[PDB]
Design a protein around this ligand. Structure first.
Ligand SMILES: Nc1nc2c(ncn2[C@@H]2O[C@H](COP(=O)(O)OP(=O)(O)OP(=O)(O)O)[C@@H](O)[C@H]2O)c(=O)[nH]1
Ligand SMILES: Nc1nc2c(ncn2[C@@H]2O[C@H](COP(=O)(O)OP(=O)(O)O)[C@@H](O)[C@H]2O)c(=O)[nH]1
Ligand SMILES: [Mg+2]
Lengths: 184, 219, 440, 436, 36, 64
């Protein structure tokens, strides 16, 4: 549950150079496929999910549907490729009044709706190997009058290339980052 | 035991027999080509360099000022061959004919669709490796081949259509065939974005017409 | 002064209307021509009709309807069928060519050649109002203007009228029987636009109404007449608290506060318990307890959705006739004693009860009987989670090879508006899981 | 308010639309001279889909009739209902094509088509909202087929947002009058894939087989076969002309059957076809429309559907019927035979009902079922055509008329295009990489 | 086991309302006690 | 009877800069930040939720 984990300055729940990377995540593939090689500039292998549909092929983070990872750190930073096709990624939260709320950022939405459990926002990938540093504890403060406690799931659907999925207790400049976490 | 839309197979117990089969995804019988018939006769100025690094085509004339109006529709004519020597001058010759020279590849591509499509109609899984490697190399090593091939997706794309989604479904299992390009539904993808990247405007329509799951990247 | 305009969109929405507007002219004394007879009264006056009808000087009653359509030969059945002079000509407004079973044709291509005219008649029907409760809409989720122009009908009404109780009745397309091949593309694109813009929404399958006409009324081979007769009785009982006063009263506002727990959960599912034919109606005494039993019963529900696979969130009952409030509460408390009928643990109260006094009227040529008392149920169960987990796959059976997508993408939209549409059913399906799991 | 203009092509086109107009005129109650001697109001509600009014109380069709022989189409006036047509609409050449599509394309058809288009614009700007046009022809000859290609290919270019129905008689495998059949048959279809998006492919030997094994006629003629085809031509587009419980126009079926923009070659049928001795003895229920209409005997094209996979199915019904029984028969057949029907379409059948039946019949139904056994017609056309074309049999009456020889070679691979497409969508799988 | 006829129809009648199609009356109420 | 609070589930997580100076004089909580510039909006309702503690180490941090 990552409960007795110390949960220090960083924490990471996937990496690409691994004997078994998708060990905790539950893979579900339908009209799709998964492999382990894609490498534009960095000579390092990378996970793959793509299929024609953006909703059936996904890898959910808790293999148990019931079990939850409780993670307190205010950011969520992934190193994920651009493809000029679709992508959705989802991470739901828990706020101060003990409610389970959502945050979805996908390529193709026009404007953000705000609703009780659901809030869907746009997202725009850069041309190269983008890495995204996501703001958790301000988006739960603008969309709702809450404060942050923990985020409980991550589930990523079709058409991207995955290496180094992690979380951050704050923001770093790229020169401050340790060398194994850097873009290059 | 049942057959179809009859008084049988309306019963409360039956086992129905559907359609027999379909001629898709299955390998086709081959035919005698014309590169065979012109290599034995002996017009080709090609020999076989036997280097330490491998095998290369020896040339006894200019490669640049060849009569490509005779020859370029005569090595795609022999691309459909699987026996060892005959596929080698076909594959290795086409690369060296194309990277040399220029300003003559434009009027010869009208006459190449018959032994591009007949290379691809065979449903064999090593030519579809080889013939879909040169379709990336065809578009690159020239100038303004893009705007001459834009009414020419109606004839060559139906065989990329059936096989565009050929990939590997292995979870954390590292593969080792990424060295060579065996995996075809990979190679069908980056060839189609190579058609849209060149070709100028108005060619983003003309793959969406034909491989219907397409998504026109590169705005 | 309690008043509501009616909108009947689509060729299937006209069929619903004339079974539901013959119903109102028998409930009052209004004839085919719109004037009550000089002799031969039907009841005591008091402007009970005034929620639906409106009055000139000379003694005429013209409904507050507008029959909007794109198919010009189904309303010409109404322009010469017996209720010819009940309407103005200007309320029945037909286009030139249909959406042709394309929501994207009805939304973008054809529908704004008839959207200025609708919102000019709508203001004239609703500025002579004073105390307008809301509107009603009647459609079906198979066809083009049932799916498409109704979205432009209400997104325009969201900003023109602000917050009025714009009610929605519907037909949800069945699991197995299906008249169309383009059917699931429409329903995942129109549920997306009847989330934000409808205040409540009523689902009813055509397949389930086939089952109870075959089994309860025991007419083999029903027709679309005997499916719109039943829908009128349900609409009659919702507004019966507004026309004829009773022991308890429940207006339209006191449903919305009382049924739906969250702003995305407004899908009740109805039934009407004494659907009994006259060869076997008058034999059995029909108490208010044993019609409360048959509302809950899973065979008789009106959507292929039974609450044995989920848990109820709130219920809402509408009794009519010879019904006394001490005997309603005797049967409400019986349901709460059984472990098979699962109520959720944020509603220990559970029920909402209205009693009216007027028995439901009976149509000539129709197929039910004249019964003293009846009941209509509007529950809200968790088991609606199977009404999109089937529609998603049946939509995704087609969309992962892009079947039929060129008939909407070319007709005025883009490819991403399908993949913003399956996401909301991948959000709605988890909400019905979320508000169903027990708090520990 | 949704008009349509009938344009008929060639000798067989004028033979088909001379009995189709008897069919329409008798089902709208009007006499040989033109007047309305009819007893209803549903016969003059929507008569403006086809007809048109004159001064003094006469109705004329919006029919324009094209021919390349002068004495052919003025034998059509001499029929029973042949004087109801306005004589300006008749357009005819002088020297015929000679049963050659090249003479009907380049040389002798290109000077008639200007006058044909003049009459077409005159009949097509007259309307209220023009839904579309109709074509009727066979793919054996040249006056019908060559002109029928040229006029659709230059009529879609100026009326493109309209609907454009095609009736095509494709040539038969084992009965074959014209020796030069396969040249016309493989040179017309690449025009009819690009130019119409709506084509009903009917065949003469399948029209013979019904009249031998089902109607059991001792002596069928081309009038009886034309009577077969027009009783499908009417029943497809009743719903424009008559009210319905659940109705469906031609725009409703054209969006519905065709999954991708090429797949539009359909196979008709008709439900209560019955011999004269066995007519009175046999009931007419909706099961006895469905079993007879889906039956592979009583089909109207040469493709047997048991040798492939149904892509989509139609049914248009005429009578007073019940929607539960109509909507349960399709489900019964589709889940009781479920290896034919395509996997990634979960309910494959479209249905409409109309209230007003054909004359003397209590009920009827009509089939339009897009199947993937249409690959076989294209394969046998390709085989006979390339067999003749390998040693260049009759090339010079098409090649001395201004042609290149590689137009044939591209017009065979524009046919091998559709063969492999129909082989793809037939063997495609619900979950991919199940078969590689 | 049954008190009433709200519960006799709602015992293990083994009819999924979402999955049974075009049924008669007698094939709805089919408890497990009739099958074995 | 009592129920566990928010103080218990926030000390195990570890946001607080509390540490215990086990003195020979007694027990005093070390502070690894200035007590003035702490966020008292974020803290003062949270130590008051530890006021309902009876077992040793958490009730001391509440009181002291
Ligand atoms: N309950 C009920 N459903 C009907 C009736 N008539 C048609 N339907 C349903 O309507 C759907 C078909 O789409 P339609 O509503 O007819 O489309 P439309 O609103 O008429 O507009 P168009 O698509 O242009 O014809 C199917 O689900 C039918 O089952 C009816 O009389 N009663
Ligand atoms: N299906 C059908 N074919 C007909 C009929 N009458 C004539 N034909 C066909 O007419 C063809 C010969 O005439 P055709 O080639 O059409 O003359 P053209 O149009 O001027 O070239 C033969 O193949 C016959 O099959 C008919 O009533 N039905
Ligand atoms: Mg409709």
């Amino acid at each position: 549950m990552f409960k007795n984990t110390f949960q220090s300055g960083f924490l990471s729940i996937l990496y690409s150079i691994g004997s078994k990377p998708l060990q905790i995540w539950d893979k579900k593939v339908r009209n799709g496929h998964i492999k382990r090689i894609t490498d534009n500039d960095i000579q390092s292998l990378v996970l793959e999910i793509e299929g024609t549909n953006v909703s059936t092929t996904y890898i959910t983070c808790p293999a148990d549907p019931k079990k939850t990872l409780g993670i307190k750190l205010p950011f969520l930073v992934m190193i994920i490729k651009n493809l000029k096709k679709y992508f959705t990624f989802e991470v739901q939260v828990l706020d101060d009044k003990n409610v389970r709320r959502r945050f979805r950022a996908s390529n193709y939405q026009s404007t953000t709706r705000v609703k009780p459990f659901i809030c869907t926002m746009p997202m725009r990938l850069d041309d190269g190997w983008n890495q995204i540093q996501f703001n958790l504890s301000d988006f739960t403060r603008r969309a709702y009058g809450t404060n942050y406690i923990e985020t409980l799931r991550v589930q990523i659907h079709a058409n991207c290339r995955i290496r180094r999925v992690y979380f951050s207790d704050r923001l770093y400049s790229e020169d401050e980052l340790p060398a194994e976490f850097k873009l290059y | 035991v049942s057959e179809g839309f009859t008084v049988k197979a309306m019963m409360k117990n039956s086992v129905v027999r559907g359609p027999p089969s379909a001629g898709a995804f299955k390998e086709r019988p081959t035919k005698p080509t014309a590169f065979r018939k012109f290599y034995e006769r002996g017009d080709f100025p090609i020999a076989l360099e036997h280097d330490s690094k491998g095998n290369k085509i020896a040339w006894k004339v200019e490669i640049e000022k060849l009569d490509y109006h005779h020859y370029l529709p005569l090595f795609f004519d022999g691309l459909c061959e699987m026996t060892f020597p005959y596929e080698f001058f076909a594959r290795q010759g086409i690369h060296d004919m194309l990277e040399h020279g220029g300003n003559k590849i434009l009027p010869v591509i009208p006459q190449l669709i018959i032994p591009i499509k007949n290379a691809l109609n065979l449903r064999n899984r090593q030519v579809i490796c080889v013939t879909l490697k040169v379709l990336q190399h065809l578009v690159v090593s020239a100038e303004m081949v893009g705007e001459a091939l834009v009414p020419y997706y109606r004839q060559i794309l139906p065989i990329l259509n059936i096989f565009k989604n050929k990939n590997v479904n292995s979870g954390d299992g590292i593969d080792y065939s990424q060295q060579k390009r065996e995996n075809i539904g990979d190679l069908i993808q980056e060839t189609l974005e190579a058609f849209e990247r060149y070709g100028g405007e108005d060619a983003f329509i003309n793959i969406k017409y034909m491989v219907p799951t397409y998504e026109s990247c590169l705005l | 002064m309690r008043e509501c305009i009616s909108v009947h969109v689509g060729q299937a929405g006209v069929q619903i209307g004339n079974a539901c507007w013959e119903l109102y002219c028998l409930e009052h004394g209004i004839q085919p021509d719109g004037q009550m007879p000089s002799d031969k009264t039907i009841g005591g006056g008091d402007d009970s009709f005034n929620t639906f009808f409106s009055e000139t000087g000379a003694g005429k009653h013209v409904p507050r309807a507008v029959f909007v359509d794109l198919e010009p030969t189904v309303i010409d059945e109404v322009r010469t069928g017996t209720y010819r002079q009940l309407f103005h000509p200007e309320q029945l407004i037909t286009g030139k060519e249909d959406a042709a079973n394309n929501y994207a044709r009805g939304h973008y291509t054809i529908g704004k050649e008839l959207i200025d005219l609708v919102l000019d008649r709508i203001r004239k029907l609703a500025d002579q109002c004073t105390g307008l409760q809301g509107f009603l809409i009647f459609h079906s989720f198979g066809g083009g203007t049932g799916s498409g122009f109704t979205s432009l009908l209400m997104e325009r009404l969201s900003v023109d009228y602000g917050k009025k109780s714009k009610l929605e009745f519907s037909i949800y397309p069945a699991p197995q029987v299906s008249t169309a091949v383009v059917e699931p593309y429409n329903s995942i694109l129109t549920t997306h636009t009847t989330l934000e813009h409808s205040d409540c929404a009523f689902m009813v399958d055509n397949e389930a109404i086939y089952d109870i006409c075959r089994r309860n009324l025991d007419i083999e081979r029903p027709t679309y007449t005997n499916l719109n007769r039943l829908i009128g009785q349900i609409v009659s009982s919702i507004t019966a608290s507004l026309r004829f006063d009773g022991a308890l009263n429940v207006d339209l506002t006191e449903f919305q506060t009382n049924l739906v727990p969250y702003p995305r959960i407004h899908f009740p599912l109805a039934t009407y318990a004494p659907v009994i034919s006259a060869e076997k109606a008058y034999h059995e005494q029909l108490s208010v307890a044993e019609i409360t039993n048959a509302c809950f019963e899973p065979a008789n529900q009106m959507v292929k959705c039974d609450p044995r696979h989920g848990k109820y969130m709130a219920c809402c009952l509408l009794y009519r006739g010879d019904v006394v409030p001490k005997d309603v509460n005797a049967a409400i408390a019986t349901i709460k004693t059984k472990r098979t009928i699962q109520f959720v643990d944020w509603c220990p109260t559970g029920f909402k009860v209205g009693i009216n006094y007027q028995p439901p009227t009976v149509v000539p040529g129709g197929d039910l009987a004249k019964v003293q008392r009846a009941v209509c149920m509007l529950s809200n169960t968790t088991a609606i989670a199977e009404a999109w987990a089937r529609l998603d796959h049946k939509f995704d059976l087609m969309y992962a090879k892009r079947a039929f997508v060129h008939w909407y993408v070319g007709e005025g939209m883009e490819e991403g508006e399908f993949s913003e549409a399956r996401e909301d059913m991948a959000a709605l399906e988890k909400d019905y899981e979320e508000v169903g799991m027990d708090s520990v | 308010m949704r008009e349509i203009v009938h344009l008929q092509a060639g000798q067989c086109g004028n033979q088909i639309g001379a009995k189709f107009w008897e069919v329409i005129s008798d089902e709208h109650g009007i006499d040989p001279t033109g007047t309305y001697h009819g007893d209803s109001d549903l016969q003059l509600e929507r008569i403006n889909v086809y007809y048109n009014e004159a001064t003094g109380g006469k109705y004329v069709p919006r029919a324009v009739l094209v021919d390349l022989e002068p004495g052919t189409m003025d034998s059509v006036r001499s029929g029973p209902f042949g004087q109801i047509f306005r004589p300006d609409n008749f357009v005819f050449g002088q020297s015929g094509a000679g049963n050659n599509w090249a003479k009907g394309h380049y040389t002798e058809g290109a000077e008639l088509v200007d006058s044909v288009l003049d009459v077409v614009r005159k009949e097509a700007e007259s309307c209220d909202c023009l839904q579309g046009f109709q074509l009727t022809h066979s793919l054996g000859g040249g006056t019908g087929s060559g002109m029928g290609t040229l006029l659709i290919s230059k009529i879609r270019e100026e009326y493109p947002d309209r609907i454009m129905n095609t009736f095509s008689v494709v040539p038969s495998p084992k009965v074959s009058d014209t020796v030069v059949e396969p040249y016309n048959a493989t040179l017309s279809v690449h025009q009819l894939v690009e130019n119409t998006d709506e084509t009903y492919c009917i065949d003469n030997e399948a029209l013979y087989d019904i009249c031998f094994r089902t109607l059991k006629l001792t002596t069928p003629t081309y009038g009886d076969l034309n009577h077969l085809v027009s009783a499908t031509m009417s029943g497809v587009t009743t719903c424009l002309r008559f009210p319905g419980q659940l109705n469906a126009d031609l725009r409703k079926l054209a969006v519905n059957m065709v999954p991708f923009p090429r797949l539009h070659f359909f196979m008709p049928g008709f439900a209560p076809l019955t011999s004269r001795g066995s007519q009175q003895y046999r009931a007419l229920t909706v099961p006895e429309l469905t079993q007879q209409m889906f039956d592979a005997k009583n089909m109207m094209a040469a493709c047997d559907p048991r040798h492939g996979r149904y892509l989509t199915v139609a049914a248009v019904f005429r009578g007073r019927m019940s929607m539960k029984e109509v909507d349960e028969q399709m489900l019964n057949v589709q889940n009781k035979n479920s290896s034919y029907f395509v996997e990634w379409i979960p309910n494959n059948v479209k249905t409409a009902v109309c209230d007003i039946p054909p004359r003397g019949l209590k009920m009827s139904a009509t089939f339009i079922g897009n199947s993937t056994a249409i690959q076989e017609l294209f394969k046998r056309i390709s085989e006979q055509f390339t067999a003749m074309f390998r040693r260049k049999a009759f090339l010079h009456w098409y090649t001395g008329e201004g042609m290149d020889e590689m137009e044939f070679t591209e017009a065979e691979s524009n046919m091998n295009d559709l063969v492999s497409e129909y082989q793809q969508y037939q063997d495609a799988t619900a979950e991919e990489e199940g078969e590689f | 086991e049954i008190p009433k006829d709200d519960l006799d129809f709602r015992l293990a009648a083994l009819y999924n309302h979402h999955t049974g199609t075009f049924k008669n009356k007698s094939e709805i109420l089919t408890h497990q006690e009739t099958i074995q």
